[PDB]
Curated annotation (Swiss-Prot):
Residues 218-342 form the RdRp catalytic domain. Glycans are attached at residues 389, 488. This is RNA-directed RNA polymerase. It catalyses: RNA(n) + a ribonucleoside 5'-triphosphate = RNA(n+1) + diphosphate. Replicates the viral (+) and (-) genome. Initiates the primer-independent RNA replication via a de novo mechanism requiring GTP. GTP binds at residues 199, 201, 397, 405. It comes from the Viruses.
Amino acid sequence: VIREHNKWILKKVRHQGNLNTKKTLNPGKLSEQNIYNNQIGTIMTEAGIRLEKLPVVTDTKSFHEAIRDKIDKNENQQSPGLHDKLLEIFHTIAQPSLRHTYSDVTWEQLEAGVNRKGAAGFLEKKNVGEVLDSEKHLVEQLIRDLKTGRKIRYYETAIPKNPRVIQYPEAKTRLAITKVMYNWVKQQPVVIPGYEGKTPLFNIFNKVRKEWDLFNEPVAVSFDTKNWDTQVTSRDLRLIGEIQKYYYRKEWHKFIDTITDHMVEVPVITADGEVYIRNGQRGSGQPDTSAGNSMLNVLTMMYAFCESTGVPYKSFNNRVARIHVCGDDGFLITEKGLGLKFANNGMQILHEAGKPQKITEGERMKVAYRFEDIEFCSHTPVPVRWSDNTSSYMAGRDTAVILSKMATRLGTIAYEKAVAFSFLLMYSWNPLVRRICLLVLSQQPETTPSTQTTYYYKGDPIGAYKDVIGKNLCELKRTGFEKLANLNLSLSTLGIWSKHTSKRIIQDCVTIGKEEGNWLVNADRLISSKTGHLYIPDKGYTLQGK
């Protein structure tokens, strides 16, 4: 049968199991009740770009397939005592100066870190914003109920991408959990080794380069687990709860134990009313998804690494191996001899540990021999050279995608100048993107940018850039030749740009800058050379939006 506190959902099954699981229980069914950034897409169109040609990503029958294909399974078998060992590894990275110190935060602190558009659970009424509007007392009640150990009616709703299965708990539950688990879930004091989730994209690789240079013969080994979420075990969850109890005040240990207990066996209700009982996995909607998977991925990799090379997990201090993670994505840097050893012995160990890596030839983990080749968070390092001849790194992506995300912002100008600024902060190493951004930022100087995106500025935009990058945009003289070119291959292979888009976009800039004055487009070293005019910027600061 099901666990006692889970039977409340059976008393609601109005129909017969229409799904077709063979391993997870399917009690039955219940009753059931993309735009363009005009100014940005325009500059792009005018430039000779073909918006239709750019890459972009429901079916109540294709969805039910995903469930049966990935979620319908037994818990991974895990080597006995594996969790005792992992917890043993956690003690080698625990921070004593924060032990038993975390607690809950105020609504004020929380409302500055939540999406008011958060979906409403299945059987639920309001959405995140609507609950904050008139139901905070109900969430506070949930908190006190969980804090004392009172089980609740926990369940998650399953929905397709907008065919990956997204599983999340009620908006009232995501609020109770986030309110108390805030600091860990949002990692304010980052306590997970190598977690880069809260690291600005424009800073990440200059940081990994510093590490890469402390090694004699540097090598990077990447983590390539498959459908990690489905590989999370009940015992994996118990572990993470124990770690959370290391950091939280004892007054919150019962809340953690309780909530973790609900997570070990979860009642899921598909958007089309189908009901199944998931057995120990990870639902992407869970507030602890990011931090929970990150710590669990680091512990598991540290374990696998030491178990492969012979290094004592007792204490490979550091400079022996540096690990960087973001959920399940991640890699590890180390000396060539040990990296190839981990590359050779890693998989079998990870497999026995319950985190099966994706199939590979000779069953080896992928290894990067050149820094430029590392892959992380959907990005890769791009080398840049400044006017004073110093070098540095920035985050590179395939330009085709950069263009896509930059136009289809699923729209005021005070908003499009913030999207442009944000992108100018992440991709000024790409002259196509860099210029599009300068053009969008040239219109309506009287309009202060929006605060609804990742980043936005205060004052002069170009001034704000110098603020976080450390140099003026005009000092950026060169981008890695082979790297830039490769990331631009897709624009030519998908016929997204014309053999004149590059020149056109430039003449559009020079035309604006040719006229005397202090025009924003003269911040781009090239345009400024062709116009003979410079852009003298003023005060400017970079702030976060969202």
